[PDB]
mmCIF file of all heavy atoms in Angstrom:
data_model
loop_
_atom_site.group_PDB
_atom_site.id
_atom_site.type_symbol
_atom_site.label_atom_id
_atom_site.label_comp_id
_atom_site.label_asym_id
_atom_site.label_seq_id
_atom_site.Cartn_x
_atom_site.Cartn_y
_atom_site.Cartn_z
ATOM 1 N N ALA A 1 69.105 15.912 3.923
ATOM 2 C CA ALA A 1 68.680 15.341 2.641
ATOM 3 C C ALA A 1 68.358 13.833 2.688
ATOM 4 O O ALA A 1 67.269 13.454 2.250
ATOM 5 C CB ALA A 1 69.707 15.712 1.572
ATOM 6 N N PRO A 2 69.217 12.946 3.232
ATOM 7 C CA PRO A 2 68.900 11.518 3.288
ATOM 8 C C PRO A 2 67.712 11.258 4.224
ATOM 9 O O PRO A 2 66.933 10.331 3.993
ATOM 10 C CB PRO A 2 70.186 10.813 3.722
ATOM 11 C CG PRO A 2 70.993 11.902 4.418
ATOM 12 C CD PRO A 2 70.580 13.173 3.686
ATOM 13 N N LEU A 3 67.518 12.102 5.243
ATOM 14 C CA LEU A 3 66.371 12.005 6.142
ATOM 15 C C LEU A 3 65.087 12.243 5.335
ATOM 16 O O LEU A 3 64.181 11.417 5.389
ATOM 17 C CB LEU A 3 66.533 13.035 7.270
ATOM 18 C CG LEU A 3 65.252 13.296 8.076
ATOM 19 C CD1 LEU A 3 64.778 12.058 8.827
ATOM 20 C CD2 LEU A 3 65.518 14.388 9.099
ATOM 21 N N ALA A 4 65.034 13.311 4.534
ATOM 22 C CA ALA A 4 63.881 13.644 3.703
ATOM 23 C C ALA A 4 63.566 12.551 2.664
ATOM 24 O O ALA A 4 62.405 12.182 2.497
ATOM 25 C CB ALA A 4 64.153 14.999 3.047
ATOM 26 N N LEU A 5 64.580 11.967 2.018
ATOM 27 C CA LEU A 5 64.368 10.881 1.050
ATOM 28 C C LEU A 5 63.815 9.630 1.747
ATOM 29 O O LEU A 5 62.894 8.985 1.247
ATOM 30 C CB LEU A 5 65.697 10.579 0.328
ATOM 31 C CG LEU A 5 65.628 9.420 -0.685
ATOM 32 C CD1 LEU A 5 64.738 9.715 -1.890
ATOM 33 C CD2 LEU A 5 67.031 9.130 -1.207
ATOM 34 N N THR A 6 64.354 9.310 2.926
ATOM 35 C CA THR A 6 63.915 8.157 3.719
ATOM 36 C C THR A 6 62.475 8.351 4.162
ATOM 37 O O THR A 6 61.648 7.468 3.967
ATOM 38 C CB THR A 6 64.811 7.952 4.953
ATOM 39 O OG1 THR A 6 66.157 7.837 4.557
ATOM 40 C CG2 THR A 6 64.459 6.707 5.766
ATOM 41 N N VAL A 7 62.151 9.526 4.700
ATOM 42 C CA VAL A 7 60.814 9.882 5.181
ATOM 43 C C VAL A 7 59.784 9.830 4.053
ATOM 44 O O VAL A 7 58.769 9.161 4.195
ATOM 45 C CB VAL A 7 60.875 11.277 5.834
ATOM 46 C CG1 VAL A 7 59.547 12.025 5.920
ATOM 47 C CG2 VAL A 7 61.432 11.154 7.251
ATOM 48 N N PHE A 8 60.054 10.451 2.901
ATOM 49 C CA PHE A 8 59.102 10.472 1.796
ATOM 50 C C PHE A 8 58.829 9.095 1.183
ATOM 51 O O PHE A 8 57.673 8.686 1.089
ATOM 52 C CB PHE A 8 59.600 11.451 0.725
ATOM 53 C CG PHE A 8 58.679 11.554 -0.476
ATOM 54 C CD1 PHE A 8 57.569 12.413 -0.437
ATOM 55 C CD2 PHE A 8 58.909 10.770 -1.620
ATOM 56 C CE1 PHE A 8 56.676 12.458 -1.521
ATOM 57 C CE2 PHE A 8 58.019 10.816 -2.706
ATOM 58 C CZ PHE A 8 56.896 11.656 -2.654
ATOM 59 N N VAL A 9 59.862 8.337 0.808
ATOM 60 C CA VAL A 9 59.655 7.033 0.158
ATOM 61 C C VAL A 9 59.127 5.993 1.143
ATOM 62 O O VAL A 9 58.246 5.211 0.786
ATOM 63 C CB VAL A 9 60.910 6.552 -0.591
ATOM 64 C CG1 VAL A 9 60.634 5.250 -1.354
ATOM 65 C CG2 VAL A 9 61.365 7.580 -1.632
ATOM 66 N N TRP A 10 59.592 5.982 2.394
ATOM 67 C CA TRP A 10 59.091 5.022 3.377
ATOM 68 C C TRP A 10 57.618 5.284 3.705
ATOM 69 O O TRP A 10 56.811 4.370 3.540
ATOM 70 C CB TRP A 10 59.950 5.063 4.633
ATOM 71 C CG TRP A 10 59.691 4.025 5.678
ATOM 72 C CD1 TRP A 10 59.191 2.782 5.502
ATOM 73 C CD2 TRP A 10 60.039 4.116 7.087
ATOM 74 N NE1 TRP A 10 59.223 2.102 6.704
ATOM 75 C CE2 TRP A 10 59.725 2.882 7.719
ATOM 76 C CE3 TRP A 10 60.608 5.122 7.886
ATOM 77 C CZ2 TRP A 10 59.962 2.653 9.078
ATOM 78 C CZ3 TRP A 10 60.841 4.906 9.253
ATOM 79 C CH2 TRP A 10 60.528 3.676 9.854
ATOM 80 N N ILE A 11 57.238 6.516 4.088
ATOM 81 C CA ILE A 11 55.838 6.858 4.407
ATOM 82 C C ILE A 11 54.940 6.576 3.196
ATOM 83 O O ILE A 11 53.832 6.075 3.362
ATOM 84 C CB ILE A 11 55.696 8.307 4.925
ATOM 85 C CG1 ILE A 11 56.358 8.410 6.317
ATOM 86 C CG2 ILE A 11 54.219 8.739 5.016
ATOM 87 C CD1 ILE A 11 56.371 9.820 6.923
ATOM 88 N N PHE A 12 55.411 6.830 1.972
ATOM 89 C CA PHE A 12 54.617 6.529 0.788
ATOM 90 C C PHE A 12 54.308 5.028 0.707
ATOM 91 O O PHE A 12 53.159 4.665 0.464
ATOM 92 C CB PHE A 12 55.323 7.045 -0.470
ATOM 93 C CG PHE A 12 54.576 6.690 -1.736
ATOM 94 C CD1 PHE A 12 53.479 7.466 -2.141
ATOM 95 C CD2 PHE A 12 54.973 5.587 -2.510
ATOM 96 C CE1 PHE A 12 52.751 7.111 -3.290
ATOM 97 C CE2 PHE A 12 54.251 5.243 -3.664
ATOM 98 C CZ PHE A 12 53.129 5.995 -4.049
ATOM 99 N N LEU A 13 55.281 4.148 0.961
ATOM 100 C CA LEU A 13 55.052 2.701 0.939
ATOM 101 C C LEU A 13 54.147 2.248 2.094
ATOM 102 O O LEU A 13 53.263 1.424 1.870
ATOM 103 C CB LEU A 13 56.387 1.944 0.962
ATOM 104 C CG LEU A 13 57.199 2.043 -0.344
ATOM 105 C CD1 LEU A 13 58.423 1.144 -0.208
ATOM 106 C CD2 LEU A 13 56.421 1.608 -1.589
ATOM 107 N N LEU A 14 54.304 2.802 3.307
ATOM 108 C CA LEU A 14 53.451 2.439 4.449
ATOM 109 C C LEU A 14 51.979 2.772 4.170
ATOM 110 O O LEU A 14 51.087 2.090 4.666
ATOM 111 C CB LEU A 14 53.847 3.233 5.711
ATOM 112 C CG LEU A 14 55.262 3.045 6.262
ATOM 113 C CD1 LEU A 14 55.483 3.954 7.473
ATOM 114 C CD2 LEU A 14 55.527 1.611 6.692
ATOM 115 N N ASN A 15 51.727 3.808 3.372
ATOM 116 C CA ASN A 15 50.394 4.251 2.998
ATOM 117 C C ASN A 15 49.840 3.496 1.779
ATOM 118 O O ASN A 15 48.659 3.166 1.755
ATOM 119 C CB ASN A 15 50.475 5.749 2.670
ATOM 120 C CG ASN A 15 50.719 6.674 3.846
ATOM 121 O OD1 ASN A 15 50.771 6.277 5.000
ATOM 122 N ND2 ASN A 15 50.819 7.955 3.582
ATOM 123 N N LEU A 16 50.674 3.166 0.788
ATOM 124 C CA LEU A 16 50.258 2.516 -0.458
ATOM 125 C C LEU A 16 49.558 1.158 -0.289
ATOM 126 O O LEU A 16 48.638 0.851 -1.047
ATOM 127 C CB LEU A 16 51.505 2.377 -1.350
ATOM 128 C CG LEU A 16 51.237 1.846 -2.771
ATOM 129 C CD1 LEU A 16 50.368 2.799 -3.592
ATOM 130 C CD2 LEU A 16 52.555 1.641 -3.506
ATOM 131 N N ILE A 17 49.941 0.354 0.708
ATOM 132 C CA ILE A 17 49.328 -0.968 0.945
ATOM 133 C C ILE A 17 47.832 -0.900 1.288
ATOM 134 O O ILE A 17 47.149 -1.915 1.253
ATOM 135 C CB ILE A 17 50.102 -1.789 2.000
ATOM 136 C CG1 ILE A 17 50.148 -1.079 3.366
ATOM 137 C CG2 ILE A 17 51.504 -2.100 1.448
ATOM 138 C CD1 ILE A 17 51.046 -1.759 4.405
ATOM 139 N N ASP A 18 47.292 0.279 1.585
ATOM 140 C CA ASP A 18 45.867 0.516 1.809
ATOM 141 C C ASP A 18 45.035 0.228 0.530
ATOM 142 O O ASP A 18 43.854 -0.103 0.607
ATOM 143 C CB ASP A 18 45.723 1.958 2.317
ATOM 144 C CG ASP A 18 44.412 2.277 3.046
ATOM 145 O OD1 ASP A 18 43.561 1.378 3.226
ATOM 146 O OD2 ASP A 18 44.263 3.446 3.467
ATOM 147 N N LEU A 19 45.620 0.349 -0.674
ATOM 148 C CA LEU A 19 44.904 0.098 -1.937
ATOM 149 C C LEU A 19 44.460 -1.364 -2.120
ATOM 150 O O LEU A 19 43.417 -1.590 -2.735
ATOM 151 C CB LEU A 19 45.785 0.504 -3.135
ATOM 152 C CG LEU A 19 45.710 1.983 -3.543
ATOM 153 C CD1 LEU A 19 46.116 2.957 -2.445
ATOM 154 C CD2 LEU A 19 46.630 2.218 -4.739
ATOM 155 N N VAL A 20 45.237 -2.363 -1.670
ATOM 156 C CA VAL A 20 44.815 -3.778 -1.768
ATOM 157 C C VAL A 20 43.599 -4.031 -0.866
ATOM 158 O O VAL A 20 43.532 -3.446 0.215
ATOM 159 C CB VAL A 20 45.934 -4.810 -1.536
ATOM 160 C CG1 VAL A 20 47.117 -4.530 -2.463
ATOM 161 C CG2 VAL A 20 46.449 -4.958 -0.108
ATOM 162 N N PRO A 21 42.630 -4.886 -1.244
ATOM 163 C CA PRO A 21 41.451 -5.175 -0.431
ATOM 164 C C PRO A 21 41.735 -5.445 1.051
ATOM 165 O O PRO A 21 42.637 -6.203 1.412
ATOM 166 C CB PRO A 21 40.795 -6.366 -1.109
ATOM 167 C CG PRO A 21 41.050 -6.045 -2.578
ATOM 168 C CD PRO A 21 42.490 -5.525 -2.539
ATOM 169 N N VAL A 22 40.899 -4.865 1.911
ATOM 170 C CA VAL A 22 41.056 -4.925 3.371
ATOM 171 C C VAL A 22 40.937 -6.318 4.001
ATOM 172 O O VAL A 22 41.571 -6.543 5.024
ATOM 173 C CB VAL A 22 40.155 -3.864 4.038
ATOM 174 C CG1 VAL A 22 38.703 -4.311 4.217
ATOM 175 C CG2 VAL A 22 40.709 -3.441 5.396
ATOM 176 N N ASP A 23 40.243 -7.291 3.399
ATOM 177 C CA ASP A 23 40.122 -8.637 3.995
ATOM 178 C C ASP A 23 41.174 -9.633 3.470
ATOM 179 O O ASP A 23 41.407 -10.660 4.106
ATOM 180 C CB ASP A 23 38.734 -9.221 3.681
ATOM 181 C CG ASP A 23 37.641 -8.741 4.637
ATOM 182 O OD1 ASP A 23 37.629 -9.209 5.796
ATOM 183 O OD2 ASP A 23 36.790 -7.929 4.216
ATOM 184 N N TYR A 24 41.890 -9.318 2.383
ATOM 185 C CA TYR A 24 42.889 -10.206 1.790
ATOM 186 C C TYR A 24 44.015 -10.540 2.767
ATOM 187 O O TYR A 24 44.189 -11.703 3.119
ATOM 188 C CB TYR A 24 43.475 -9.584 0.516
ATOM 189 C CG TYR A 24 42.675 -9.656 -0.773
ATOM 190 C CD1 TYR A 24 41.308 -10.002 -0.813
ATOM 191 C CD2 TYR A 24 43.333 -9.282 -1.958
ATOM 192 C CE1 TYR A 24 40.610 -9.988 -2.038
ATOM 193 C CE2 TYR A 24 42.640 -9.259 -3.178
ATOM 194 C CZ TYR A 24 41.276 -9.609 -3.222
ATOM 195 O OH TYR A 24 40.625 -9.550 -4.411
ATOM 196 N N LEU A 25 44.787 -9.550 3.225
ATOM 197 C CA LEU A 25 45.892 -9.802 4.153
ATOM 198 C C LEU A 25 45.414 -10.401 5.493
ATOM 199 O O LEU A 25 45.992 -11.411 5.897
ATOM 200 C CB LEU A 25 46.783 -8.550 4.301
ATOM 201 C CG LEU A 25 47.480 -8.110 3.001
ATOM 202 C CD1 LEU A 25 48.189 -6.777 3.215
ATOM 203 C CD2 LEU A 25 48.507 -9.132 2.527
ATOM 204 N N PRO A 26 44.379 -9.878 6.188
ATOM 205 C CA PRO A 26 43.888 -10.478 7.430
ATOM 206 C C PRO A 26 43.464 -11.943 7.268
ATOM 207 O O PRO A 26 43.787 -12.767 8.120
ATOM 208 C CB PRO A 26 42.695 -9.635 7.859
ATOM 209 C CG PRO A 26 43.050 -8.263 7.317
ATOM 210 C CD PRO A 26 43.737 -8.588 5.993
ATOM 211 N N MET A 27 42.798 -12.308 6.165
ATOM 212 C CA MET A 27 42.399 -13.700 5.951
ATOM 213 C C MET A 27 43.591 -14.566 5.549
ATOM 214 O O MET A 27 43.695 -15.698 6.013
ATOM 215 C CB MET A 27 41.299 -13.815 4.891
ATOM 216 C CG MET A 27 39.952 -13.355 5.447
ATOM 217 S SD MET A 27 38.576 -13.830 4.382
ATOM 218 C CE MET A 27 37.229 -12.973 5.238
ATOM 219 N N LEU A 28 44.531 -14.055 4.750
ATOM 220 C CA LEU A 28 45.734 -14.795 4.379
ATOM 221 C C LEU A 28 46.562 -15.109 5.639
ATOM 222 O O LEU A 28 47.001 -16.238 5.824
ATOM 223 C CB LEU A 28 46.514 -13.963 3.350
ATOM 224 C CG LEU A 28 47.845 -14.587 2.916
ATOM 225 C CD1 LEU A 28 47.608 -15.880 2.139
ATOM 226 C CD2 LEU A 28 48.595 -13.605 2.027
ATOM 227 N N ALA A 29 46.702 -14.149 6.557
ATOM 228 C CA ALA A 29 47.414 -14.344 7.816
ATOM 229 C C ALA A 29 46.715 -15.398 8.694
ATOM 230 O O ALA A 29 47.370 -16.269 9.270
ATOM 231 C CB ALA A 29 47.519 -12.996 8.538
ATOM 232 N N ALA A 30 45.377 -15.367 8.750
ATOM 233 C CA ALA A 30 44.572 -16.341 9.474
ATOM 234 C C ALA A 30 44.705 -17.748 8.869
ATOM 235 O O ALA A 30 44.961 -18.703 9.602
ATOM 236 C CB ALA A 30 43.130 -15.834 9.482
ATOM 237 N N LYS A 31 44.660 -17.883 7.533
ATOM 238 C CA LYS A 31 44.796 -19.173 6.829
ATOM 239 C C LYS A 31 46.193 -19.774 6.996
ATOM 240 O O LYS A 31 46.315 -20.970 7.241
ATOM 241 C CB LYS A 31 44.432 -19.013 5.346
ATOM 242 C CG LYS A 31 42.922 -18.808 5.155
ATOM 243 C CD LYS A 31 42.570 -18.561 3.683
ATOM 244 C CE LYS A 31 41.065 -18.314 3.522
ATOM 245 N NZ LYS A 31 40.692 -18.073 2.108
ATOM 246 N N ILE A 32 47.244 -18.963 6.901
ATOM 247 C CA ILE A 32 48.633 -19.404 7.114
ATOM 248 C C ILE A 32 48.883 -19.799 8.578
ATOM 249 O O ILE A 32 49.676 -20.701 8.842
ATOM 250 C CB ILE A 32 49.623 -18.333 6.598
ATOM 251 C CG1 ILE A 32 49.493 -18.235 5.062
ATOM 252 C CG2 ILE A 32 51.076 -18.617 7.015
ATOM 253 C CD1 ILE A 32 50.430 -17.220 4.399
ATOM 254 N N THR A 33 48.172 -19.201 9.536
ATOM 255 C CA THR A 33 48.350 -19.481 10.974
ATOM 256 C C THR A 33 47.450 -20.620 11.472
ATOM 257 O O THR A 33 47.810 -21.316 12.419
ATOM 258 C CB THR A 33 48.048 -18.197 11.769
ATOM 259 O OG1 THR A 33 48.988 -17.206 11.426
ATOM 260 C CG2 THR A 33 48.132 -18.347 13.283
ATOM 261 N N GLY A 34 46.290 -20.834 10.845
ATOM 262 C CA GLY A 34 45.319 -21.876 11.204
ATOM 263 C C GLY A 34 44.234 -21.420 12.189
ATOM 264 O O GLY A 34 43.514 -22.247 12.739
ATOM 265 N N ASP A 35 44.134 -20.118 12.461
ATOM 266 C CA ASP A 35 43.162 -19.513 13.379
ATOM 267 C C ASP A 35 42.002 -18.833 12.608
ATOM 268 O O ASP A 35 42.096 -18.599 11.408
ATOM 269 C CB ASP A 35 43.929 -18.551 14.309
ATOM 270 C CG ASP A 35 43.113 -17.995 15.481
ATOM 271 O OD1 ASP A 35 42.010 -18.508 15.768
ATOM 272 O OD2 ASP A 35 43.599 -17.052 16.141
ATOM 273 N N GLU A 36 40.909 -18.498 13.287
ATOM 274 C CA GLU A 36 39.718 -17.837 12.720
ATOM 275 C C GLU A 36 39.337 -16.577 13.536
ATOM 276 O O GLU A 36 38.280 -15.982 13.331
ATOM 277 C CB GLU A 36 38.562 -18.855 12.685
ATOM 278 C CG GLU A 36 38.609 -19.780 11.454
ATOM 279 C CD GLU A 36 37.881 -19.257 10.202
ATOM 280 O OE1 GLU A 36 37.427 -18.091 10.174
ATOM 281 O OE2 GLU A 36 37.755 -20.025 9.221
ATOM 282 N N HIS A 37 40.199 -16.139 14.458
ATOM 283 C CA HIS A 37 39.987 -14.977 15.335
ATOM 284 C C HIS A 37 41.268 -14.146 15.498
ATOM 285 O O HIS A 37 41.425 -13.398 16.463
ATOM 286 C CB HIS A 37 39.452 -15.442 16.702
ATOM 287 C CG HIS A 37 38.267 -16.375 16.643
ATOM 288 N ND1 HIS A 37 36.943 -15.994 16.418
ATOM 289 C CD2 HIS A 37 38.327 -17.731 16.737
ATOM 290 C CE1 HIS A 37 36.236 -17.138 16.369
ATOM 291 N NE2 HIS A 37 37.042 -18.195 16.563
ATOM 292 N N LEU A 38 42.194 -14.265 14.542
ATOM 293 C CA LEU A 38 43.478 -13.574 14.547
ATOM 294 C C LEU A 38 43.336 -12.093 14.172
ATOM 295 O O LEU A 38 42.836 -11.751 13.101
ATOM 296 C CB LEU A 38 44.416 -14.307 13.564
ATOM 297 C CG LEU A 38 45.849 -13.746 13.501
ATOM 298 C CD1 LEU A 38 46.642 -14.077 14.760
ATOM 299 C CD2 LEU A 38 46.593 -14.340 12.310
ATOM 300 N N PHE A 39 43.780 -11.196 15.050
ATOM 301 C CA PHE A 39 43.799 -9.760 14.783
ATOM 302 C C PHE A 39 45.021 -9.473 13.902
ATOM 303 O O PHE A 39 46.114 -9.928 14.229
ATOM 304 C CB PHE A 39 43.910 -8.979 16.100
ATOM 305 C CG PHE A 39 42.779 -9.197 17.085
ATOM 306 C CD1 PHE A 39 43.080 -9.451 18.434
ATOM 307 C CD2 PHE A 39 41.437 -9.127 16.669
ATOM 308 C CE1 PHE A 39 42.044 -9.649 19.362
ATOM 309 C CE2 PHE A 39 40.405 -9.331 17.599
ATOM 310 C CZ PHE A 39 40.707 -9.596 18.944
ATOM 311 N N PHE A 40 44.869 -8.742 12.796
ATOM 312 C CA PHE A 40 45.997 -8.411 11.917
ATOM 313 C C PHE A 40 45.706 -7.167 11.075
ATOM 314 O O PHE A 40 44.922 -7.243 10.132
ATOM 315 C CB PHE A 40 46.311 -9.623 11.026
ATOM 316 C CG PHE A 40 47.615 -9.517 10.268
ATOM 317 C CD1 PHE A 40 48.816 -9.877 10.899
ATOM 318 C CD2 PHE A 40 47.633 -9.096 8.929
ATOM 319 C CE1 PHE A 40 50.023 -9.841 10.189
ATOM 320 C CE2 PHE A 40 48.845 -9.062 8.215
ATOM 321 C CZ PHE A 40 50.038 -9.443 8.843
ATOM 322 N N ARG A 41 46.320 -6.018 11.388
ATOM 323 C CA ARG A 41 46.122 -4.755 10.644
ATOM 324 C C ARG A 41 47.355 -4.437 9.806
ATOM 325 O O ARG A 41 48.451 -4.294 10.346
ATOM 326 C CB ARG A 41 45.858 -3.582 11.604
ATOM 327 C CG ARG A 41 44.516 -3.699 12.331
ATOM 328 C CD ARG A 41 44.306 -2.524 13.287
ATOM 329 N NE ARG A 41 44.095 -1.251 12.573
ATOM 330 C CZ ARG A 41 44.101 -0.045 13.112
ATOM 331 N NH1 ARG A 41 44.527 0.165 14.323
ATOM 332 N NH2 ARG A 41 43.675 0.982 12.446
ATOM 333 N N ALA A 42 47.197 -4.343 8.486
ATOM 334 C CA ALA A 42 48.326 -4.165 7.571
ATOM 335 C C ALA A 42 48.828 -2.726 7.388
ATOM 336 O O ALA A 42 50.037 -2.506 7.379
ATOM 337 C CB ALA A 42 47.905 -4.746 6.216
ATOM 338 N N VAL A 43 47.946 -1.731 7.273
ATOM 339 C CA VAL A 43 48.353 -0.330 7.072
ATOM 340 C C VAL A 43 48.945 0.252 8.363
ATOM 341 O O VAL A 43 48.212 0.607 9.282
ATOM 342 C CB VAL A 43 47.187 0.520 6.531
ATOM 343 C CG1 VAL A 43 47.704 1.859 5.991
ATOM 344 C CG2 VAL A 43 46.427 -0.169 5.393
ATOM 345 N N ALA A 44 50.265 0.406 8.449
ATOM 346 C CA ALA A 44 50.942 0.820 9.674
ATOM 347 C C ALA A 44 50.729 2.289 10.051
ATOM 348 O O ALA A 44 50.798 2.621 11.225
ATOM 349 C CB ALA A 44 52.435 0.521 9.516
#
């Protein structure tokens, strides 16, 4: 039972971050780091 609750709510959150625009997090990570060629993929 705790395995199923952990699996369902965690996988749901790992998938939900796909709804925010695809360039927001990669550019925010680049701006906070000071680079213009930083690889950064948010949806795990």
Side-chain angles (χ1 to χ4, degrees):
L3 165 64
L5 178 66
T6 305
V7 158
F8 180 84
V9 185
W10 188 28
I11 291 176
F12 177 81
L13 289 185
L14 299 178
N15 290 356
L16 186 64
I17 60 187
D18 199 2
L19 274 60
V20 306
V22 83
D23 277 286
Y24 281 14
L25 297 173
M27 285 193 186
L28 177 66
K31 288 176 182 180
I32 294 181
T33 296
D35 189 13
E36 277 271 8
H37 310 281
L38 183 72
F39 300 133
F40 191 84
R41 292 179 69 192
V43 195

